[model samples]
Structure formats: structure tokens, C-alpha cells
Target: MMQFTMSGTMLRFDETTLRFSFSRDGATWSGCDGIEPQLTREDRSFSFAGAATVTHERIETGTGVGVRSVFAGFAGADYAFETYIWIERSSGDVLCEWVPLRIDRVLWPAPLSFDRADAHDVTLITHEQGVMIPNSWPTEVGTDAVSFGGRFETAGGYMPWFAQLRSDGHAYIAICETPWNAGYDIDHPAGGPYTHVGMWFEPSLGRMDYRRVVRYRLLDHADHTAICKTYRAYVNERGRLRTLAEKAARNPSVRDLLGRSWVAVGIKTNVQPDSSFYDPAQPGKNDSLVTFAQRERQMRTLHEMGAGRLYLALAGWAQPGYDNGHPDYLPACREAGGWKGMKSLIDACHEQGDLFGTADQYRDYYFAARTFDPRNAIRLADGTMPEHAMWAGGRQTYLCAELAPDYVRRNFSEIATHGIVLDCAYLDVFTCNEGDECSHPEHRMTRRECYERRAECFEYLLAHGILTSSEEVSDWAVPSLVFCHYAPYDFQMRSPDAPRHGIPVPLYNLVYHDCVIQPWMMDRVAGGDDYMLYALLNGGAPYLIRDAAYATENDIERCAVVAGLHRRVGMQELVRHDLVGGDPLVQRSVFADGTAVTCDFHAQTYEVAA
Candidate 1:
């Protein structure tokens, strides 16, 4: 056993059990419910405690003293690694580092054992916008049904961190310093008295090429707000918290996206023969087409209905249809009036003071594309390509992100040649999907490299005066992205009839509401609270119309109510969120500019005070 103390906290590590326990002010947090560190190779798995030899020593770190443990010959496998735990003297923050000679994936720095039965004890995860799982919540969370597998740079974790706050007002936030090739593992059963969250690391470009670090900051006398603000400060100091005002300085059109309602409509949809959506029983049902002129009329109708400040996101506008023939998507669907007609619609949007953007995909590589080649697809470390036929582009593979920028430059240049100026552009699935890793020697790429290329694609659009939007607002995309389809809560994506996993919280907004322009689904679900209340609480734009799968009640007046508040607070930071009267359903959010919105979910009502 090894013990270390910093500030008012003491950390104890059991070498044989490979577990850690933290103590502060008569409080204790067991790490991982006694689960030990694990490592996986290509064909076997072992625990670090099972190593043939384990040695530890105290070492001097740049900021403070650290205990370093070295493990060799892990359970008869020819592998070794070192673990270092240190506390910074200035901040009393614990830093965990993993240095491995060889590894496939390592699970270490175990989750804090939070098994209290109190309903006030909660786990905060950045699934979409955010979710707060009370220990006693009756619904199962982190299940495969709705799991993004805890992948970062995706909807699984919007901000590369997870936090826990106990009923005793003790809290801690774990921030992943190397999040590109890492993610979290969550296990919370239905009606849980415990929620275990841990970190997982995978090889980058066929090898664990670098060190992985996670910083832990334990706190006393804190709540969720304090935990979120700590992370916000960490990001701001690193220069990663880029606000919309800073983005507008580069692309002036970014200001136009604030407070605007979203209109998602597609132009053409052709399901390939082998697509999972294709139906042999009805051949004609596999395809559909809506002319650009018809869509233009729909926008005008909304304008006539007094739908103020709208941004129309047109999908399936390419020759091959929605989700089909990406990286080669172009010409604006000949049947929908070709390039000339598409340009006219854009011109019309500009004249009416509305915004227009086309949905283009760069990752989903379709085999049916004119320039389709297997060489362009990502190759796994095992020299195999991941193939799937679930999308409209049947039998598809991912386009290596290393080449995504070249394609973005090519496709956007062609559109510009036709005298069309896009107000915005939606890069489908970039923010919502995990970054790809390719082992192809010709274009070998790591997950970190993949994200850089994805950002390069966004930068290309911004350089050309086009605002960049994606499926979601990931932390990495905040630097370049202007807006998103929707940064909704995790429950919003699931069936309305399904049980909710936790209390809905604007955790993402608390840190990034002013950084990205997110539109919220304005659906009034049956037997449930109005979603518009959430939009108001988050200070988000409203979606006038969405390609919704579930039933919804649409009211223009309700949308206007949400949009009106957004206009006042859209560009301001979400400074604070509180549960009014200690009622989770009755929440309040305060913006930087003294605008406050309080919503009572149980009563189905809200109030906006500026």
C-alpha cells in the first residue's frame, strides 16, 4: 500500500488490488467498486496485478511528487507498462499517466466507486448535451440500446470528461488529456445504487504510440455547477473554448445563424438495391424526389406564416441521393433542376433574408459512386476494411479522413464555379461519429489525425465564407463549427415511450452554449413535458420542421416563444443552471447577460425573465 497527501486530501493505492481510495474531510470514494486495472492484447487479456513483477518508487514531477509503478511480463505475456499518479501543488489536482511498451487497449485509473443510495448522488455524462443520472433513477443507462460506446469526439462524450457529485457535496471531474484515441466505459443498471465509469485507451495507427493522461480534480463543498465551471476554466486556459463572437470575427455570417429556426428538408432520396432501407416488394418506394422550386415555395410559406429568421438545410440534393456517393457528391440532382435551379433557390433565400445550406457527406464512401475505389476507404490495423450496408448508400465503407479535405476542396470548388454562394454547409456525421483510424501505409492515419482532417474540411468552408454545421456540437468541432443540427439530450433521440435514463440537464450549455449555435427539437410529446421548454432553458434556436420519426405536436406560437428568448441570450454564455426548489423537473438557467429562464416540467409551464 502507498499513501500520499496533498492539501486536505489523501490518496491511498493498494498495489495488489490495483485500486485507489480517496479521502477528504471525513469523506471516502472507493475506486471502481474494487475493480482493478485491465489490459488487452490482440489475443489475450490480463490484469496489471497479475504481473510477474511489480515495483514502485517515489519520483519528482515538474509540479509535485509522484508515485510510479512499473509492471513487467504481464501474466506470461511479453508486455510491460508504467503508471504514475501525481498531485499538482498549485491546484491539488491528481494526474494519472499511462506509459506502455505495447498495448491494444488499457483500462486504468478506475472509476470512483459511487454506490450511495441517496437520490441526490448523481453522475454527469456528456452523451449529447448532457444527462444527470441520479443513483436511484429507475431507468438503465449506458446500455447497448442507446450507447455510443463512450467514444469521444462523438455524441458519446461531447466534452471529453465525466463528473460525479455525491449527496455530501463532494465531487470530482475527470478530464482526458489525450482524448483522441480514448473513451469512457459506463455501467449503470436500472434502479442502481451504483454507477461505475472508467477510462479506456486504444492504439493509435496500429500501436500505442504515445502516453495517455487523465487529470482528476477532487473537490469539497461543491455541486454540479462548480464541477462544470472547473472544466470550463481548464478549457479556457488551454485556448480551446472558442466562442461564437470569436468565430464571427472570421466568418461574419456566423452572427446570422444565432436565434434562427432550423428547417430540415431533403431534395432526392434513392435507396440502393442492397441498402437496408430498400424494399423489393415496392420497387418504386425505394426512391423519392422533391424539386428545388418546391422546397423554395415551402420556405416562402413559412415566411408568410411569420416564421422569422430561418435556416434551411437541404439534404439529398446530389445526383445519387441522400447518404449516397459521398466525396463525389455533386451537380445538385439533375432532376431537381441541376446547378442552375439550385443556385436560384440560394439566391431566393438571400433575397428573403433567410439562410441556405446543402447537406454533403465525406466519410460514407459508396461503392456505387462514379469514382468509387476501395483504395480510398479506411483500412483497419488488421488489413481489413469495415463494410456496412445499413445506409442509403448500400455496401459502403468509411472514406479515410486523411483524404476528406481534398474531397471537400474539390466538391465545394465545383459548387462555387456555378455561381452559387452557400450561406452554410452541413458535413453529415463528422461530429456525431468517432474519428477513424487507418493503417494503410500510403495514407496511414491516427484518430488524432482524423480529427484534424475533419477540422480542415470545416476550415475550408469557413475560408470560403460558408458557415460550418454538423450533426452535433462536439468539443473538438467548437473551434471551427458555427452551428449544428441539434445538440439535444440523449433521451430526445430515443423513443418517446421509452423510459428516461436520467434527469435532463444543460451540462453542455453550461460550458458551451455561447460557443456553438444549437437548434432544439420543438416537439410537444404526448403524455410528457414540452420539449420547447428545454429549448428555452438552454437558450437554443428552435426547429420549425425536422425529419422526425416520432409523433410531435407543432405550434408556431410555441416556437416563437422559444425563439424570442434565444434572440436575447443566444450569443451569451450559460453562466449557471439550478434546480429550483431542489426540484430537478423545475430547472432554471441564467445567461451571461442577466437573462433567466425557468421551466416547470411537472406543470408544463415556463417563465422568461430578462
Candidate 2:
């Protein structure tokens, strides 16, 4: 059995010959017989079994009988390990690796780089951003060995850092920090930041072996810290270290703030009310400002058609009237804030008992604010301001999430006061803000940290009892955001043929349902009533149908059918689906009792059975 101590000490086992000691205050850990540990407190350097030769700048080779060694520390009381030298020769270059044992069975070898000749100096750091802290830290006192503490420079801002460790003589190391491989890079324009407080491992030269196993715990920080105390007694003779990585690789679903399954779905309601909204004036006229009665009718149609929950697109500053001097509804444009007319629409939906949400183009808002109040906006590298014209008409603008705490709060409060429940907030291209070309120097945060800050905004909303959801998909958002909305089935079938689109919906349904902490929803515009019904029956949660005005009587009837189905099956039951593919538009969702609903988007068909 794994041995754990009451004083918050942990020992990671590697057979009788190799074991690691973790303490709340101790810097160096005692190893098995014949293993002597060496460590430096100032720079946090570690080595074991006598000094290893620093061959090839970045590679360290073992010379003595120091077969294995371990180092431990306390983020608070949680124990974490780091390896100094785990070297192996491959191709023509020597490679250095770090194996964090705290993580479950996964060792991340830095991408091979010719820049670093010695891997010992390569530090692995976990960076965090925004107001929300990562839950990867250990919480239990006696069983935990690591704890991290720091203060943010700004409220509701971002922070990112590298959690580095000196490699010891062990072939493996364990890490316990915030979550990893958050899906932020996949969907968001700004990549979310990560807090990596895990372990590092190094291999020996002559061993000709290249493998490291790092253990990780997914529990809340306190629970993970307490669990570290038992690592010392858990022997890994069978080489089960790849378990965590395998699981992560196999499962790509994002977790939600409430620890439930979530998936992001997006709707494109680019309903510009002013012709001047588009510089070159597109073919479609501005229809978003359709009278309140028309908007309510559309929303009611959607709600009855099973779209009880959805993000209603609204005109932002990108709308024509705001930039030009058209004063007919000027105050409403400014009062509705960036996404013009959204507050009223959200209120209307709420009054009808429908969940209302909106998309916050954070970057655009920040950029636009800079033109008016330079001090209130993010400072650019040129000492002027960063501007993007894509969605801002001719006006320059900055991203909103990068704004000061007061600004974020003001915006949040303003929207909240308008009766907009804000069930979900969409963040597009969060990763772009973290990339190299970013001109905002005031945001000294690393790329990953920037992402964290954006996620924090979502978390803050969630803490207010609002179900936080976003279109940007990232692992960081998994912990706090509740849902991810995916794009609709393909648009090639101009006539709304369900057969051509059955595959994508079902594939998404099976791939995401129950896979991540969040569930998936299908978003399609102009799907008509038949397509809407098929989409919902396929296990897609919170169905979205664009251009409801064009919905036919048959479509309306079918929508009512799906709405009834939603009432028959609860939200939880509707999210469970058995995914299968043979058609692009076909999808399936299963219930807790094994009941299943299958949808064929192309055929406009839905079937329910056991």
C-alpha cells in the first residue's frame, strides 16, 4: 500500500530501489540507500548521486551509481517532484526530458530545440492570468506538500508565469499545478494561459532509454495536495505512467466551472440595421432592428421549437448608425453598449422565460475605447493605440478583456442592469491576444496567462449565479464556463437537404457528448423547421435556428414536436447521445435510461426509441 504521513509528507515509489520523499518545508528529499541528493536553494538547482557531467550545453549525463533521485517542495503542503538529469542520446543530439510524477503517467519532453545546449537550465513554469486562480494546487494540510501564493497587479486582469524546477537524477518527476492542454488554443482568438506547477525528469546517457512518467491529480487543489502524501508508497513497477496522457489524448472534452460537461455553440446573426454598417454595403439590408413585436415573435418561435437556450446576436459598434451621425436611435445605440440593441432583446427573451445570451467581442471593444479615452484603454507599443477595422467599420478599437478592472466591472454591471441574464458570453480568438504580434505592452502577461484572464471573466460571471458559457473553446474555460457551441452542419445543401448534413451533427454529438465536462449544441442558420427538429433530436442541446421568419408551417409543427420532446426529457437527458457517422447531418443523443433520439439533418427526420 502507498504510505502516507500525517504531517503532510509524501513518498513516490519506484520499486524498493527508487523512491521519492516530499515534505511541506524540506527542499531536498531523502532517497533509497546508496542515493545522495544535492540541491541549491538560491537558484533552485537539484542533482543526485554525485555531480553529473554537464555534457553538450543542455544535456546532463549520469556518471556515478545515482540511478535515481527525487526533490520535493510545498506550494502550500502539496508535494511535487522535479528531475535534474534524465538524458538520452537520439539522432545526433542529446535530449533532456522532465517527467512530472504528480501528473498521472505523463512526461512532457520539451520540443527539441538547438538553442539550449543544457536542459538543466530549461525551466518549466505554470502561468496564470485574470482573477480566477487555478485549482491544481494541493489543499489538504497533512498530505499536501506544495502551495503557491501571489498577488495580481490588477483586478479582473491577466497573469501568466513559468513554474520552473531544477532536474534531479530521477528518470521521472511529478507536477501538480492548474490544468493542462486547455482547449483555449483551438477556438479562442486569444490563447488562454496555463499555470504549470508540475515536475521535471532527466535521463542518463548510456542508458539509451528515453521514457518518463509524470503523475497528475485532477481534484481540486486541496484534494490534490492531500493526495500527494501517498505517492511515496505507491509502487510503479508495472510502468503504468502513461495512464494520464492516454486519458487526456483519448478525451478532448472541456470541463465546465460547475464540474459538468460543456460544449460551445455559436450563431451568426450579423443583422446590421444600417446600410452604412458595412463599408462596402453588402447585399442584405439591415434587419436586426425589426420592431420589438417581430423580434419577440421570432424568439417565441425559437423557444417553442426547442431553442429554449441560445445566444441572440445583436448589432455592435460595427452597426452603421453608431459611426455615422444618424441620430434617430443614437442613445439606444450608446446605451445598449457595444453590442447595440442587445440589452433590450435579452430582456425580451428573459420576460418570455427563455435563456438569453450574447457575444462579447472583447478585443474589438478594447480597441475602440482607445480612440476616445486613451488612458482608459490598453497602451500599444507605438505609444498610440492598437486598432482593427475588420468589425469596427472605420473606427479603431482595442480588445475589452485587457481593459482595467473598473471598465470590466462597469460593462458587466451595465449589461446586468438591463435585465440581460447573460446565460453565456462568447469570446472569439482569445489566443490571438497572446501571440507575438500583439502590440499591447501594458499586458505584460505571457501568452497562456492572457488566456487565463479571459477565462477569469467568464468565471466571475458564473460566480454571480449566472450560467457562464462561451464560444471560445479552451481547457482553462473548462473549469468555469458551462457550455461550448459548435458551428452548424455544413451549408452546401442550399435547399435544406438533411441527408447531406447528417454526418457532421452526429459526429459532433458522439465525439463531445459526455466526453468533456461540458455538452455540445449544434448551430445552423436557415435550417428551416425540419432541420431544426432533426438537429434537436440528434442529442444537440440548446438548438439554434437562424432566420425564423422563413420557417414554413411544417417546420413550425416539427419544432413544436421537438419542444415537447425536450419537456419529456430533461436537459441532462437531452445531452446524452450515442454518436455515429455515415451521414454528415445525422446525429444521435441518448438519455440516462438508455432512451435515444436520432436526427437526420439532410432527411429532416427524427426517431426516438430505446
Candidate 3:
């Protein structure tokens, strides 16, 4: 047994059992609850803590003492890995590092034992905007169909961290230092008394190239807000917390995007014959075409009907139709009035004091595209291609992220040549989908590299005075992303009748409300919750019109309510969020400028004050 104490925190490790525990302010947390560390290869999972011989030594650094542990060869399999655990004496932060020798995957530095059956004890996950699961809540979280599997940078994990808070306000936030190629595994059954969340690290470009690190800071008298701010400060210290003000300094149009209502409409849609969505019974139903002239008239009608400060996101403007041919999607559809008609529509939008953007895709490579090439598709580590026909584009594979930026440049340059100036460009699915890994020798890419390349695409747009947007406001894209389609909570995407996995929380807005602009759905479903309450509470812009989505009467008035508050706090940090009167159903959010929004979920009503 080994023990270390610093800054009101005590950490203990047992060599025989390979378990760790930490105590702070008279509260203790057991890491993994005696669960053994697991490393996987092929089809077998090896428990290094159970079979490997261990050796450890302490090294005295200028700041503190740290332990280094080496584990050699598990039962019947010899795997090499080393773990280093240390406490930063000055900050009371515990850091863990894992160095592996060509391992397939490893799950180490396990989850804490946070199984209290109290309603206030909750787990905060950065899934979309965020979710808070009370330990005693009846609904299951990780087992739900809408779960993101805690993958970093995707809908799974907008931020690379998770936290648990107790009723007494004791909490600890775990930040993944190496988030790319890493994710959290969660298991929470229905009516759970526990939520187990552990970090998992996988190979990058077919190899575990470097060390993976996680930092933990235990806190007393800390609520969810404090836990989120701790992560915000950590990112700020690393210069990764780029705010909207920093972004507006580069592109002035970013300021114009704030508080504007979003209208998403498609011009043409072609579900290929081989697509799963293709309607065999009604062949013509698979294809759709709405001319640019018709859409321009619709935009004019919306403005005339008192739609204020609108931003139009146009999809299917390319010749190959929606989701059909990407990367090679160019030359406005002749059937939809060609490039001249499209340019005219954009000019009309600008003339009406509105903004316009195109919905373009970079990742989905359609097999029938003009430039389709198997070599350009992503090749997995197992030397095979991932193919699917789920999208409107039949038989699609992912375009290796390494080549995304080049396509962005080529396509945008072509759009510019046609005299069509874009206010913003929504790169479909770049933020919503997990980063891809490629094993092609010519352009080998890791998940980390994939995210960098994706950012490059956004950078190219921002450099050209085009505001950037994506399917969601994922943290990795925050530095360059100006707006998003929607950043609603995971529950918001599902049917209103379905049980909510957890309490809705603005965890993402808590950290990034001032960094990226998010739009919220405005649908008021029948006999269900009103979404406008959420929009007002989060200080988010509202969607005036979304294809295939329903928004009833008074939507125009509802938009004004959300847009008014957003105009004041759209670029301001959300400084505080509290459950009012100790009632989870009644909550409040305060912006940096002291604007507050209070909502009563049971009543489906809200109030905004300044």
C-alpha cells in the first residue's frame, strides 16, 4: 500500500489489488471500486491488474513526489504498459498517465464509486448541450437509444470531461488531456443506484503512439456550475477556450449571426435507387425539386410576414441534388434555375437585409459521384472500407478527413467564381459525426489528425469571410465554428413521448455560451413540453422554420421572445444556473450581463428579466 497527501487531499493505492482511492474534505471516492484495469486484443480482454507483475518507484520532483508503475505481461499474454500517477502540489490536481506498447485498447484510471441514491447526487455528461442524471432517477441514461456512447468531439461528448456532484456540494471533474481517439464508457440501468463512467483509449492510425492523460480535481462546496467552470478555466489556461469576441475580431459577420432566426430549407432532394430511403412503391417520391425562384419568393413572403433578422440555410443547391454527390457537389442545379438563379436568390436575401448560406457536405462520399474513387474513402485499420446506404446518397463511404480541406477550398473557390457570396457555410455532419481514422499509407490519419483537418475546413471558410457552422456545436469546432444548426439536449432530438434519460441541463452553454452561437428548435408539440422555454432559458436563437418539423401558431411571437433575450446575451457567458427553490422543475440561468431567465417545466412557461 502507498499513500500521498497534499493540499487537503489524500490519495491511496493498493499494489496487490491495483485499486485507488482519494479523500478530500472528509469525503472519499474509490476509483473503480476494485474493478481491474482492462486491456483488449483481438477478441480477448486481459486484466493487467489481476495477472501482471507490478513494480513501482517514487521520484521526487521539484514540485512533488510521483509514483511510476510498470506492469509486464498479463496471464497467458505479455502486454507492456506503464502508469504514472502524480498530484500537483500547488493545485491539488491528480494526474494519471498511461503509456502502452502497441496495444489495441485500454480502459484504465477507472470511474469513481458514486452510487449514492440521493436525488441531488447527479452525474454530468457533456452529451450535446449536457445531461444531468440523478442517482435515484428512474430513467436509464447510457442504455438509451439516443446515447452518444461518450465519444469525445461528437454528439457523445461536446467537452472532454465528466463530473459527479453530491448533495453536500462535493464534486470532482475529470478532464481528458488526450481526448482524441479516446472516449468514456458508461453503464446506468433503469432506476439505477449507480452510474459507472470510465475512460477508454484506443489506437491512433493503427498504433498507440503516445501517452494518454487524465486530470482530476476534487472540490468541496462545488455544484454543477463550479464543476463546469473548473473545466472552462482549464481550457482557458490552455488557450483553447476561444470566445465569440475573439472570433468576431477576424470575421465581422459573426456579430451579425447573433440573435438571428434560422430558416433551413432544401431546394432539391434525390434519394438514389439503391438508398434505403428510396420509395419503391412511389418512385417519384424519391426525388424532389424546388426552384431557386420559388425559394426566393418564399423568403420574401417570410420577411413580409414579419420574420425578423433571418438567416437562410439553403440545401440541395447543387446539380447532383441533396446528399447525392458531395465534394463534387457543384454548379447549381439546372432544374432549380442554375448558378444564375442561385446567385439571384442570394442577392435577394442580401437586399432584404438577411444572410444566406449553403448546406454543403465534405465527409460522405457517394459511390455514384462524378469523382468517386475507392482510394479516397477512409480505410480502417483492418484494411477494409466502411460502406452504408442509409443516407439519401446510396452506397456511401466516408471521405478521408485528410482530403476535406482541399475539397472545401476547391468548392468554395468555384462558388466564388459564380459571383455567389456566402454569409456562412454549414458543413454537414462535421461536428455531429465522430472523427474518422484512416490507414492509407499516403495519407495516414488519426482521430486527432482528423479533427485538425476538419478544423482546417472551417478555418478556410473563416479566412474567406464566411462564417462557419455545423450540425452541432461540438467543442473541438468551437474555436472556428460561429453558429450551428442546433445544439439541443439529447432528449430534444427524440420523440416527445419518450421518457427523458435525465434532467435537461445547459452544460455546454455554461462553458461555451459566449463561444459559439446555437439555435434551438421552436416546436410546441401536442400535449408535451414547449421548446420555447428551453430556448429562452439557454439564451439561444430560435428556428423559425425547419423542414419536416412542426411549429404551431404564434411562432413569430415566440421567436421574438427568444430573439429579444438572445440579442442581449447571445455573445455573453452564461455565468450561473440554479435550481430555484430547491425544485428541479424550476430553474434559472443568469448571463454575464445579469440577464436572467427562469422557467417552470411543469407549467411549460418562462420569464425573462434583465
Candidate 4:
């Protein structure tokens, strides 16, 4: 019912349906449908558009043009919701944004916010790692089905942006620039003209107590790489863009990590007595793994074999094994050669041109820890603590991330003071897990503030001359973190026989390969794809050794091809990448120096072109 022109572009919307059509120049970009606000209370929810009384406006404020819409009187609802779709012509920030007003008695700021109607030829999201799922992207869910939905964010997702390119040479990018509890729920049926990659605004911290916004950009070209670059520019304009090369300048030691591969050696692990699989009768039931001295030999052997540069990420080197005693995970295992053995191992790695970093968990607070106080944990709206016994660390609550930096300082500062040479450290789940909000007055925090605190932990490690890493890649972590444990494909993380979600693409690499270092799994799982191919396609470093505890047949192996790929793209920036044949199996990635890596999954082969 309204039309507006900003900068050099124009937009027209059908007020009743919320559908919009846009154009810049004579090139026109149209949409089928747009967003609808939804609210939730307890277990029931309703869309704002369906509410009893709905009103909209064409507000003209100092902030240029904005389409403001209001909703009220849900059949049985108790509160009203207001949505502001704002934009600016002064700055070429040509994205329509949804900014919220206020809400009362809302347990969650929930939104099944819709995107334009089904129309894109392809959809690119930072899905489980990064991938490109075409509208016809094969799926177990029938093509004609509505949609099953896809989730990404704080952790489970590698990137905060998603773009859909149409065959009409027009594309749109949605960047959750501030991904606190923000995520994307994509709905793309194989039979469509639209893929609704909606923004998910759940009551991430406490409630709908504040405003949440999602920005988007419309481009002339329909390419994922270019759309991602536009987002990268937006991030940089806000002074948030970070590259590993830049971090290396901040802490010179990080420079050595640039193209180096890693060896994840599991030294010890504990299954708490309360764990479902724990059996008290078995000997060494709780603690089962390698010794520092044992792994020291492995590192020396790897160097002797041909590993010129390596990072050994030692897990379970502390108390109660790997997952058991977190936050309190120090005082190196006396059985695994104690502090003396640990020191020797690190020294050994240093002598052989390898780096050593210990793995520690902070978020998953197990009940067995001496410092495991539920008072410092995150609580739900009704003051009930969220507890889970799923992990090896049994019956646990999360350590308030606000309080994590103190522990990082307490444990590692003292360990370093004790003459333990530390080069790096892995703070588990910081990026892989969503932000945590503590309700206790003593340490009250919001999800957005929680990330600032988590970044403080990484910043603390960096200031102490230790390279920092986490579970996976996240936008917030890039400024302080040097690398991540792994950012595998969604299909790679699923069970071997699980159905395909879509073709796994290197969307993250195309955007951030230069900004951060990512190590890929070398495992060749049974009846499945060879993950090594992903390492090559992404132009990433490899894991020469990914040995896990508690099992001998776990899928871990050595991939010689990684060395070949690394030699080519190790120090080069990932310039661009694309699906060569429309089928993801045939792909090519070009580097900054004009080095091209073409990988053929169908042939299980790859070739390097300089």
C-alpha cells in the first residue's frame, strides 16, 4: 500500500500481505512475500498479523523512511507487539530492518519472522559450517513438503549471514550482525520461487525486554561470494572485522599458527559415576586415556615423519579427565606424568617446532567440581536452573560466562606461574554454545553482554601470550580468537547414514578464510564422504592426528592430501569459490594469489592450478 525511494533504489509493498517489490536502475527485483511477527507465551504462540486489531503506518522521522506496523488483541493473548521496518538513504545501508518496540508478560521474544516468499534458485547459509542448499537441493523431506526448517547462530552455525540468489541476477543478504541468541530458520521447498530464510528471535537472555534487529542488503549480482563480501564490508565498517594476520600483529606468537596443522591428542577422559554409561565395577572406568609422556613421544614422532609445523591440542590433561571437572579442570593429572611430565611434553613440542595447547571446558559445569555452584548458573524465567546429564560431565549447569574470565585467569595464570610453558589453549563451547544469561542479581547478565564477557576470556588468554581457540567459528570470536577446533560441514557432523541436508559448500571460507584459521577432520567415516575433501575445498589446515579416548576404532586418520593443499593455500587468502557443475561434488576455490584448487568429490580427487 506504500512506495519509497532511497539512495538510487525504490521499494513498493502490498500493505495487506507485507510483500515487497524493489528495483535499482531499470533492473527490478521483486518478492512474493515478507515477514510476519509471532509471539509466544508458555507453550502457546500466535502471529501478530493474526491478532485481533492490526494497524500500520508510513512514519517519517529524522531516520528517513520506515514502515511501522502494530498488532494487538490475540484471540486470548494479553499483550500487544509493534514492528518497525526501518531504512536509511543518507548511508547506502539499503536493507529493510525490523526493530521492536515493547512487550508485556512475554516469556520469550519469539519470532518466526518470515523472509520473502519462495523464489530463489539457491540459498546459501552458514549452515553447520557453511553450505549452499539449492531450492532443488536434494532432501529426505519431499520437494513438495512445506519445510522442516534450519537453525544457525552463536555456535551451531559458523556464519551470521544467509543469502539467496535468484536466476534473475539479483540477490539479497541477511546478516544477523548482532547474533546474541539470533539465528536463522530457513524454509525452502524444492518446488518454489521463494526460500524464507527468516530470522529467529527467541527470548535469548531474559525476555523481550529489549530490541532485536536483523539487517539485509539487496545486490545486483546473484553470487554468494559477492554477497558475503558485502557483509564483510558492513562488519568492517562497524570496526569488528578481524583477520588472523591482524591478531598475529597484536601478539607476534600467533603469526606462527597461520598455516600450521594440528594433532588433537586425547590424553585423558572421565565418565562421571552418575553418567548413564558409567560402570563402577570396571577398572579405570572413570579415567581412561593416554599420558603426557605417551603423547610427547607421538609429537616427536610426527615431527620426525615430516610435520614441519604443528599444533598439538591436548585434551583431558587436567583433573577428572576430559568432560568431568571443568572450570576446576587443572592441576595436571598426576598419573599422566604430573606437572613435570606436562612441562616435558610442552618443551618437547617446542623443541620440534610444534606448539602445545591444553583443552578446557568452562560452560558445562559438572556437579563433581569443587566450584560447581548452581547459584552462579543461568536460570529460566521462573528461577529454575537448566540441568542436563547428557555429557560425560554428568548433572551439570553452565558456568556464568561473565564469571569464566576469572577462572581462566585463576587456573592458567597460576599454571604458567608454576613454570608450565603455555603457547595455546582451547576454551570449549565458547563459540559452539549460545550465549548464557544469569538471572541471579549477584551476576545478572544478558545474552549480548554474555558474549562480551566470553570475548574477555579469549582476550585474557591473548594478553597473556597464549593463542586462543574454541569449539567452532563465530563472528564475535574472530576479533580475539586465532582459530577453532573445527568447522565441519553439516552433513559431516550428522550420523554416517543420515540423509543429506544439501550440498556442503565452503561459504565460510569464501568470507573468512583469511580472517581465521580452521582445522578440518581427516576422518574417513564408514560408508560416507571423505572429510579430507572438505579440508582441500576449504583450503584449510588438517588434523594429522585426531585420536579420541574410550574407543580404538573411532574415525580418525591421516590424510596426505592435506599437506598438498596446505602447501598451495596455507598462506594465501581464499578469494572466491563456486559449485562448478551445479552439483556440489564438483567445486573450485580460487585464492588471492591466483592459486586455484579444484576438487572433484565424485572422483575422490583434486588438482592444484597455480
| Candidate 4: tens digits of C-alpha lDDT, residues 450-487 | 77898999998988889889988867777888888887
Tens-place lDDT per residue, model 3, 22-71, is 88889888977566788888888867665557788876676665688898
lDDT of 2 by residue, 256-336 (tens): 122111212222223233223443455354323343344556676766654433345332222333222211112234322
TM-score for candidate 1, residues paired by index: 0.97
The best candidate by TM-score is 3
> Which candidate tops lDDT?
3
Worst 10 residues of 2 by lDDT: 181-190
Cα lDDT tens digits, model 1, 1-610, are 8888876667788767778877767777778755778888779877788889889887766677668899998546677778988867777778899997666788888778888778899999888888899998888777364457888788988988999999888888899999998888888889998888888889887677799999988888987878889888999999989999999998877888876888898888888889888888888785888998998888778888888888899998889888888878977899999998888888888888999998899999988888999998899988999999988878889999999999999999999999988899999889999899898887989888898999999999999999999989889988888888889898898889989878889989898888899999888899986888999999998888897411112467777888788888889999989998879989999999888899998899999886
**Global lDDT for candidate 1?**
0.86
TM-score for all models, in order of appearance: 0.97, 0.45, 0.97, 0.89
* Best first by TM-score, ranked: 3, 1, 4, 2
lDDT of each: 0.86, 0.34, 0.87, 0.70
lDDT of model 3, residue 168 = 96
Clashes of each: 0, 142, 0, 6
Off by over 4 Å in 1: 41-44, 143-146, 548-554
Worst 10 residues of 3 by lDDT: 548-557
